[PDB]
Recover the amino acids of this structure.
């Protein structure tokens, strides 16, 4: 017999309480997978589900000392763990799961299949998910004001759209995106609109994750990056002045792996799932201590070219090279965006961009040509070519040019190599970088006589 | 006769609960030895096992207040510990144990004998664990693409196969492996294949273990690498600039030991079993604190020399000396690898490699000749020969050489030592190494003190 | 028992130090992998800890325990490839 | 009770000092082999600590504690072959 065990068995049959691989119980309440560790929810589930049981059982789940017994049975009857958050194309709302690829919306049991334990936190209203509305027109005008639809701004606008649209996709992204531009360009407006659109899947964390060591001790500023689909960090401490701690390349290389290592306070979990699109907002170019191909492989940049200025400075805004258009600053827009007026309009816009840009595999791409630092490392790769075995037959021509040969290796004097390199690049402008490049790749050929087995591309091509 | 005690005795007689020296209470549920200090599993085992007990006892174990009583009895009945996880040639799966020496898969009672307290975490499908299948063909193609089967890459591929196959052995591996290579070469793909093949016997950890104090204080980055068979700390902090903490040699020595000291905080434990083979996916050659002969024995390296360039940058990579081959990137390969596709094919390949490379004893061997940072103390070994008694019979030759005969030894002045060091290597590039060697190996000879009683290797070999 | 080298390179009392607590009433304490002090850049072994280890009783407690004294019956052996240094 | 020179150089109260709490009701405290300040580098005998050790009360709280008031009865003796130096 034991009525309470029968009730526990039925509640297990409905398949509502589950055990995760992080050792925590997720319950299914109000058409959403709720999850908590300091306020256990199993008694809430028992009291909520008491309606579906027969009449002889529902009158017994009213005493707390019996809901706790049913809880004990349930906890002792769960042995096998399950894996959660395995679908990367479903957006979970506080009352269901919107399917991005098909466009349909599921609620109730239909949404139970997809174990999504991080929801936006606000209900999905199907009367606002419409293309035609005054809010949609106002939002479209605002977006066209922030990023104009001109001819010279096509690529930058497309990259902006792709970056904003990736905030819906629940996979791991392979770039970091920098929003760059002068003051009053609309970057924080995009931040606030995006937050109002995707709710609790948006987290703002300090700059410490980009400068401090990830592991160290406790570091909740990265332990809160667990499963959130957008991490947006602002106010880069411009490094033009001295005393500014530069950005570390290994931090960039560590914020791209599908799992970052960092733990909260009073916790041992040191593995966080990294679904987040990381967007860093800055008005000044960033500085990297070490630059290589790996760092150039994980940087993207979006530039803002519009100033919303009050008339008292409009003339001052009309005489600057850092903009391309000046508009009237709106005093009441911050209050309107704060009130979540453009929430579902922007969610619809985001879903349309997601459908457009999601060619069977959507991948964030890097743009190293727009960062001033990487120009030096790109031009050198486009100017100097390393000699190899295929150039052995033309060794006489290389010797006639001014090079020397030793042990089937082409080499030139260090001072001669420096003069040849400085023939097309500024020695004083990038002295430290040039010295680092020369020393790092220096490989002696003969006894001492340090040299580098690389020659100018134009010199090699020209006989 | 106090029925609950009879039930406790009956459950204890089957040897399903055991006490380990650390104080853990491992329980045998669902063909696996689970243990969890958070939610004790003894009540779970009682409820699971009530089926086998007689009809009178079975109905008594439906009330939590009685399962707690039986658990108390069982806890008070276990007075003797037991040694766990002793057999190092067995691979524990979530539904049994695979005998790596033979190949048979044991489940149920036959797999109970081995007190393997860790598991991969997934079932073993004998249908997929097969030699021929499309997944096997694609996986073999990928592996041959990462490390080519060419004759020049013979030793490298052999070491690569051995380093990966040592992830199945349950012994205490005696070396460290460095996955070193340029960007976009295949290190992360191999890490993900290994992570999806070995399962939960694989953990990622930060760089604190290799750069900071192992003991210090509470360090969960060492408590989690207990009984793990593969630890994959990665992303070394770009030691090219030499502006960051170097990996302390003491850490390297303490890591390659049968026990590693960590986690002095709570949940009693101070020592952890170092079953793991540590692989550090680097990007530049490592920089150490103090180079010694002991640290020359506990370090290896595997070099990846095949690029996976985008079609736009195929030409640029085709002219780089850091790549011995250039191929075209596959966009959806990572999606398939992370989707647990090549999970059993790679386990089969690893088992085959394990059988191939396992002589009567398998041992990892270092390759210190690869690391440039270890060259100088190696070069000194080939450039300096200590005084030998049998070399005394060269009086005329010693007089012709110019050495000073003092205390039945050949000594030279400090200026002569500096001249010999300059003639042995570049002064600027090896001044620190020469000074450190002179300071460490200084003896009592020549004028006053600070004299090295070691002749040049060529001079010592010569009469 | 084998414990890390925090015994020689830090204040004995400090906070909770289970490393010294597990040495309670032991006989053979091996500590290995001592850094080379010839090259600057490593904290040296303090003479205070060396003097304290020779006392009959040593101070230090485990975590979630009120027992703060531990008898020093042990022989401490440090395995090092380089000569040690002291303050 | 026998204590080291830890109180003769560092701040008397400062942080959690075991000897600060151990001076509670102990009738005698002895320090031996003082860290001679004659050679350059060694800290001078802390005049603040010597001045603060004379009062009939002891202020000090160890780790995981709140009581800071101790009755002082100990006679303090220092033994060494070097003349003390106080800045
Ligand atoms: N569409 C718009 N029309 C008019 N003013 C706008 C518009 N979008 C933004 N603004 C103005 O810019 C502000 C938001 O951008 P702001 O935070 O000033 O940018 P930044 O953070 O880059 O300095 C708004 O509060 C308003 O003052
Ligand atoms: N055999 C292969 N064929 C094609 N692309 C591959 C192959 N192996 C890996 N790749 C791709 O190469 C890219 C970079 O590989 P990865 O190992 O992550 O580089 P890194 O070693 O620099 O971390 C990814 O797109 C990955 O899917």
């Amino acid at each position: 017999g034991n009525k309470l065990f029968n009730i526990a068995q039925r509640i297990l049959d409905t398949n509502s309480v589950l055990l995760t691989e992080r050792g925590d119980h997720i319950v299914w309440i109000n058409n959403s997978w709720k999850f908590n560790s300091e306020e256990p929810l199993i008694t809430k589930l028992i009291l909520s589900i008491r309606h579906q049981l027969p009449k002889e059982y529902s009158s017994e789940l009213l005493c707390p000392r019996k809901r706790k017994t049913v809880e004990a049975n349930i906890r002792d009857m769960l042995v096998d763990s399950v894996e959660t958050d395995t679908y990367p194309d479903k957006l979970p709302f506080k009352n269901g799961v919107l399917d991005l690829v098909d466009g349909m919306f599921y609620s109730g049991d239909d949404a139970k299949k997809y174990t999504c334990t991080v929801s936006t936190g606000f209900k999905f209203d199907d009367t606002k998910f419409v293309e035609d509305s005054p809010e949609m027109e106002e939002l479209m005008n605002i977006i066209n004001d922030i990023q104009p639809l001109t001819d010279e701004n096509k690529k930058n606008r497309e990259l902006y759209e792709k970056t904003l649209s990736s905030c819906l996709c629940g996979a791991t992204k392979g770039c970091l995106t920098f929003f760059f531009g002068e003051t009053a360009t609309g970057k924080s407006t995009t931040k606030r609109l995006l937050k109002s659109a995707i709710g609790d899947l948006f987290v703002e964390t300090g700059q410490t994750i980009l400068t401090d060591v990830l592991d160290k001790g406790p570091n909740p500023f990265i332990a809160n990056m667990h499963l959130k689909r957008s991490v947006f960090c602002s106010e880069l401490p411009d490094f033009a002045c001295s005393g500014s701690k530069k950005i570390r390349s290994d931090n960039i290389k560590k914020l791209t792996e599908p799992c970052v290592i960092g733990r909260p306070c009073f916790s041992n979990k040191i593995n966080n799932r990294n679904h987040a699109t990381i967007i860093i907002d800055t008005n000044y170019k960033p500085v990297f201590d070490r630059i290589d191909n790996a760092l150039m492989r994980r940087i993207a940049v979006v530039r803002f070219r519009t100033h919303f200025s009050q008339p008292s400075g409009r003339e001052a805004a009309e005489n600057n090279d850092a903009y391309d258009k000046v508009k009237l600053l709106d005093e009441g827009l911050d209050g309107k965006i704060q009130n979540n007026r453009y929430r579902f309009a922007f969610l619809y816009l985001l879903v349309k961009w997601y459908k457009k840009y999601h060619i069977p595999i959507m991948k964030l791409y890097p743009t190293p040509e727009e960062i001033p630092d990487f120009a030096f490392y790109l031009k050198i790769g486009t100017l100097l070519v390393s000699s190899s075995v295929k150039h052995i037959p033309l060794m006489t021509d290389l010797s006639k040019k001014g090079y020397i040969l030793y042990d089937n290796v082409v080499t030139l004097p260090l001072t001669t190599f420096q003069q040849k390199i400085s023939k097309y690049f500024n020695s004083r402008l990038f002295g430290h970088d040039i010295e680092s490049f020369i020393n790092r790749h220096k490989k002696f050929a003969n006894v001492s006589d340090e040299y580098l087995q690389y020659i100018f591309i134009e010199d090699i091509s020209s006989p």
